[PDB]
Design a protein around this nucleic acid. Structure first.
Ligand SMILES: [Mg+2]
Ligand SMILES: [Mg+2]
Ligand SMILES: [Mg+2]
Ligand SMILES: [Mg+2]
Ligand SMILES: [Mg+2]
Ligand SMILES: [Mg+2]
Ligand SMILES: [Mg+2]
Ligand SMILES: [Mg+2]
Ligand SMILES: [Zn+2]
Ligand SMILES: [Zn+2]
Lengths: 36, 100, 67, 91, 206, 53
RNA sequence: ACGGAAGGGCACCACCAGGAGUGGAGCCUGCGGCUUAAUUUGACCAACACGGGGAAACUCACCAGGUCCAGACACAAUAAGGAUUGACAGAUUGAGAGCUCUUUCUUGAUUUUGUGGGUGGUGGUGCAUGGCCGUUCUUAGUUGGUGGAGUGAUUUGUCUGCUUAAUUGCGAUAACGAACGAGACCUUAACCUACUAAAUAGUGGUGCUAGCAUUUGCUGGUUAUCCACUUCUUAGAGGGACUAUCGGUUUCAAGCCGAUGGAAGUUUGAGGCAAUAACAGGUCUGUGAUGCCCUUAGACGUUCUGGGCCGCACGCGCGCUACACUGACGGAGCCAGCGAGUCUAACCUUGGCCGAGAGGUCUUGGUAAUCUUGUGAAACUCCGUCGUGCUGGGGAUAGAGCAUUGUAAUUAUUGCUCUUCAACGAGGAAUUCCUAGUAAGCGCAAGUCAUCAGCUUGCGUUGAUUACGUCCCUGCCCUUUGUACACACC
């Protein structure tokens, strides 16, 4: 039942394979990116 | 005059003896020093199975046995006479290995 | 038993029908002569045919027989 | 099946560069023996375009064999954007 | 690898090739393969009734078969090569006859006509006896079995391993499977290897 | 998910399979055949196992 | 076809004569029943240590739950302001599972949603099937061509009698001539101072060398100490037996019965193969063999965790261990065959050391007539302790501990140590197997195997009694015969 909320039309971390398109998400005290 | 050992192994005794006789005749017509063809004991690889593909009927068994006959012949020959004897035994069904 | 089959008896008949001024009642000479006059595909069969031929020669020597 | 586009491109590259693929029947093998791709990925990319055509398959003791055809040559030529002179290795 | 395991695996490899070529070259009239192992490269001799569809246009088919076997059995490229020359006699191969009649049945043909055609061809190709058994749901019934035999057939003893060619096929009819058993009693006279007659056959010179 | 889609299969009946039919039962492991007993009965002559006695 | 009809022949899956038993006990294992969430299921002479079925996980099919799509593709609705995929932490869950949610990052026409069509299924149907097997039937049986008989089904051929293991032959003869089966054949186990050859086999004596004895002899190490040889060992081409010779018995023969000879005289012993017709025999749970029916995303697909398959008022089958003195125990003797075994990795292990043991550790040899291995097997032999009692027979049950395999030993995997020491006093009615290197006793190797034999497959060590027959019982073959049977006396 994975919904995949639409996320209609809309910073950085280590592992430089994350090339400036890995904008972080901040829930609370989060330093973890989308790739990891 | 390098000392080599030729190992012949096959399931077909007829062709095994054919190749062994070819090599012995070659050695005798080229006047080498050869240890005779030693016939190492034929090994009867038997495997026992149940005839039925299920569990029904009289318990009738089979042994399928495959005889692997192997011979070894070690002699002394120069490089030309080892190359020629290792290129002349190309008989199918016999595995021939030359070890120096 | 030791009942000789048709394959042996008929062969012995034919051998004796064409080779009577030939092999005597000795089994060894009978079989060695079968070796040359007949293409028998097994040593056991040639032994049996030669033995029956020797038997028939021996029974001829006591008087003739049918066949 | 959902497999990455570059993995599918690797499967297509291999298929058009040697012509035929031999695949273990193991939908769990991590990496294909010759292709740097999941064995499941190879098998299912072929259960893919094979059904469109482009491939003949034979099972033969649990080991898939896939062979390329003429329509397959055309399809992979177009897919990989190749000039009409790079024949498969089989030719 | 020890000699036992190596020649066992050699037999296994030959069996695997035989099944592969049965499934691949069925419509090409495949009849059997021969694996010759040489010090430098391995030659795979295919015996087929039609060695032109096995080869293909300019050798495409045989080349793809070579590279398929290459990749499957993991040889260095170039170390294995296929030659599909010819079958000595189409009518004397049980595999070839069974596959041909399977194909006739699949294409749609009377069982009796197809089997008697196979038997007649085998008999006129010099065989001293042939038999075809077609078993199954020939018509909607309790799945009877028909036999179509000509000549004589010794079965069995040692001479049956000596010279009897037996092949079995599974034919897929729209109602289930038909079973094909093809048995050929080749002429012992033209053996060209091994015994030239039956063990009990005695010939006398005079 | 992908982390748990398999537990060890390094021994036992589930580690092996008939190289012809992928059957786990009745396997032949002698001499490394790895062929089910029924498949082996079907194609022993191709392998070279014959009946003599 | 059948007969509680006849005639002849035959079979230890029959009996006689006997042997070893099983049925009586403990335990093992399968089957039923009961129980259960499930205790998956097939099979009822020819099911029941059978499914190679010795299930901890896997296998697995069953049970309680949990993921994934491994739903190709022709199609239309979602999509270039992102279809869809993954996700850290926490809830949540057995689970560090992003299953789902909290929340907003990542990926980008690789899939989602609906339609059709596919795909997998140890799902059903073995009474839809193939293939394979088992059985009818381990007997000797079966079938054309042409001729003969009959309206015909059909019959003769294919037989009165002798003979044979045999439809094997002698022969007889409206049949002649043939085909399959049997036999022939192949594999093996016996002999062969015959040929060929062998530090991957062995022996003499020469090197070297210990002991003992010393007039030079015995025992033996000399695994690179050379020569000679092939008797033992191995394996190729062959030899050898064909019931040979002789007596007697035979219808006229096929043969038979003795004796000698001979390695071997029952088809030389043991097998492999093995006809015509069948069975609603087993197998859809071996198969990517398979028709149809069922299901196919909350899966009957597949995977994962746990459980079960083993469960216990009871009945049955195959087994093992026993009930003891022809024995138990302890020392010492020290005798096989058939086999298996690891190179991209973990198999068979010698030897050393650690340990009481099981076992551990350091090396070694072996891809093998090379090393494990002379598999230094067990019964058995010798000498002692026991001394007839449920005993020092038996070893079930159970407690404690220590190792081993395994991701994981709980419902004890196995092994080892100590301890508890049950039934069982030779076994009802019944019923099994068996005739000579056989029965029976004994262990070993292999198969299943990560670990697990009381199982099977083969192998050898020790090795009887009885009989050399019969048709009484149970069956089979042939012939005649009766039949109201043909689904064929169930
Ligand atoms: Mg026979
Ligand atoms: Mg007992
Ligand atoms: Mg399933
Ligand atoms: Mg007539
Ligand atoms: Mg008749
Ligand atoms: Mg039934
Ligand atoms: Mg069970
Ligand atoms: Mg009655
Ligand atoms: Zn990052
Ligand atoms: Zn199999």
């Amino acid at each position: 039942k994975h919904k995949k909320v639409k996320l209609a039309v809309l910073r950085e971390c280590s592992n430089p394979t994350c090339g400036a398109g890995v904008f972080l998400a901040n829930h609370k005290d989060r330093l973890y990116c989308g790739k990891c | 005059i390098i000392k080599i050992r030729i190992t012949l192994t096959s399931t077909k005794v007829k062709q095994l003896e054919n190749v062994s006789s070819n090599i012995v005749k070659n050695a005798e017509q080229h006047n080498l020093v050869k240890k005779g063809p030693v016939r190492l004991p034929t090994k009867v690889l038997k495997i026992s199975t149940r005839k039925t593909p299920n569990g029904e009927g009289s318990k009738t068994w089979e042994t399928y046995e495959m005889r692997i006959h192997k011979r070894y012949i070690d002699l002394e020959a120069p490089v030309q006479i080892v190359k020629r004897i290792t290129q002349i035994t190309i008989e199918p069904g016999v595995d021939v290995e030359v070890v120096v | 038993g030791r009942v000789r089959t048709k394959t042996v008896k008929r062969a012995s008949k034919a051998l004796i029908e064409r080779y009577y001024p030939k092999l005597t009642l000795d089994f060894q000479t009978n079989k060695r002569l079968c070796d040359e006059i007949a293409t028998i595909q097994s040593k056991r069969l040639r032994n049996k045919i030669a033995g029956y031929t020797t038997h028939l020669m021996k029974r001829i020597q006591k008087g003739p027989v049918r066949g | 099946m959902l497999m990455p586009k570059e993995d599918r491109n690797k499967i297509h590259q291999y298929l058009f560069q040697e012509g035929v693929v031999v695949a273990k029947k193991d939908f769990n093998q991590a990496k294909h023996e010759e292709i740097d791709t999941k064995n499941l990925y190879v098998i299912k990319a072929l259960q893919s375009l094979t059904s469109k055509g482009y491939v003949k398959t034979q099972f033969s003791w649990q080991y898939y064999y896939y062979t390329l055809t003429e329509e397959g040559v055309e399809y992979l030529r177009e897919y990989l954007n190749l000039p009409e002179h790079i024949v498969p290795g089989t030719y | 690898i020890s000699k036992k395991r190596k020649l066992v695996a050699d037999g296994v490899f030959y069996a695997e090739l035989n099944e592969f070529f049965t499934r691949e070259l069925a419509e090409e009239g495949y009849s059997g393969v021969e694996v010759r192992v040489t010090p430098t490269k391995t030659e795979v001799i295919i015996r087929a009734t039609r060695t032109q569809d096995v080869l293909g246009e300019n050798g495409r088919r045989i080349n793809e078969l070579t590279l398929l076997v290459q990749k499957r059995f993991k040889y260095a490229p170039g170390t294995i090569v296929l030659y599909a020359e010819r079958v000595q006699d189409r009518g004397l191969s049980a595999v070839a006859q069974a596959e041909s009649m399977k194909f006739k049945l699949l294409n749609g043909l009377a069982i009796r006509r197809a089997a008697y055609g196979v038997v007649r061809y085998v008999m006129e190709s010099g065989a001293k006896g042939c038999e075809v058994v077609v078993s199954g749901k020939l018509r909607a019934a309790r799945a009877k079995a028909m036999k179509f035999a000509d000549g004589f057939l010794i079965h069995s003893g040692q001479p049956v391993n000596d010279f009897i060619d037996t092949a079995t096929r599974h034919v897929l009819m729209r109602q289930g499977v038909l079973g094909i058993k093809v048995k050929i009693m080749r002429d012992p006279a033209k053996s060209r290897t091994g015994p030239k007659a039956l063990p009990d056959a005695v010939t006398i010179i005079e | 998910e992908n982390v748990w889609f398999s537990h060890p299969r390094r021994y036992g009946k589930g580690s092996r399979q008939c190289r012809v039919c992928s059957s786990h039962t009745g396997l032949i492991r002698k001499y490394g055949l790895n062929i089910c007993r029924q498949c082996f009965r079907e194609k022993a002559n191709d392998i070279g196992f014959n009946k003599f006695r």
